[PDB]
A paper describes a structure:
Initiation of macroautophagy/autophagy is mediated by the ULK1 (unc-51 like autophagy activating kinase 1) protein kinase complex and the autophagy-specific class III phosphatidylinositol 3-kinase complex I (PtdIns3K-C1). The latter contains PIK3C3/VPS34, PIK3R4/VPS15, BECN1/Beclin 1 and ATG14 and phosphorylates phosphatidylinositol to generate phosphatidylinositol 3-phosphate (PtdIns3P). Here, we show that PIK3C3, BECN1 and ATG14 contain functional [name] motifs and interact with the Atg8-family proteins with a preference for [name] and [name]. Two hydrophobic pockets, HP1 and HP2, in the Ubl domain of Atg8 ensure binding of the side chains of the φ and η residues of the core [name].
We first tried to co-crystallize [name] with a [name] peptide. Co-crystals of [name] with WT [name] peptides diffracted to 1.14 Å for BECN1, and 1.4 Å for ATG14. They all display 3 conserved hydrogen bonds in-between the main chain of the residues in position +1 and +3 of the [name] motif and [name] residues K48 and L50. For the BECN1 [name], the 2D peptide array showed that it is a canonical [name], but it was much more sensitive to substitutions in all four core [name] positions than usually seen. The F at HP1 could be effectively substituted by W, but not by Y. At the hydrophobic +3 position only a change to L is allowed. The Kd measurements for the [name] peptides were completely consistent with the GST-affinity-isolation data with [name] and [name] as the strongest interactors with the LIRs of ATG14, BECN1 and PIK3C3.
Author numbering:
A (entry chain A): 0 to 117
B (entry chain G): 94 to 102
Write the structure that this text describes.
């Protein structure tokens, strides 16, 4: 029951063409949409559409997103993919292949809460 | 790639 607003701004056919094309142009990268979860009490990131090395781990990706967001040091942040916090040691390539949608994008939500949408 | 943001390199 994940709701990514990005899917409302671009038609599916447009997204799928872009996802397939960017994967063909940069096979060592994965395209990722990173969006604040419903109800999250965190700011939005400056950017939503990312291109990520496939061998980067989830923990490294978290480091870089947690660094970029406008939070104080004490503030909490959690990621969700398909309603589930991803494993720190997984690669972004694995996470992408396991979870990308039919448009060839991976969708990651983030929240201050440990359960998506709370 | 123009509309994408590279992160993690």
């Amino acid at each position: 029951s994940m709701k990514f607003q990005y899917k409302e701004d671009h038609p599916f056919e447009y997204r799928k063409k872009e996802g397939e094309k960017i994967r063909k142009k940069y096979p060592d990268r994965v395209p990722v949409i990173v969006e604040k979860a419903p109800k999250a009490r965190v700011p939005d990131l400056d950017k939503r559409k990312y291109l990520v090395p496939s061998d980067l781990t989830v923990g490294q990706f978290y480091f870089l997103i947690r660094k970029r967001i406008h939070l104080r040091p004490e503030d909490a942040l959690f990621f969700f993919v398909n309603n589930t916090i991803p494993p720190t040691s997984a690669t972004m390539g694995q996470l992408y292949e396991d979870n990308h949608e039919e448009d060839y994008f991976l969708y990651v939500a983030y929240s201050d809460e440990s359960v998506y949408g709370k | 790639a123009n509309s994408f943001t590279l992160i993690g390199e």
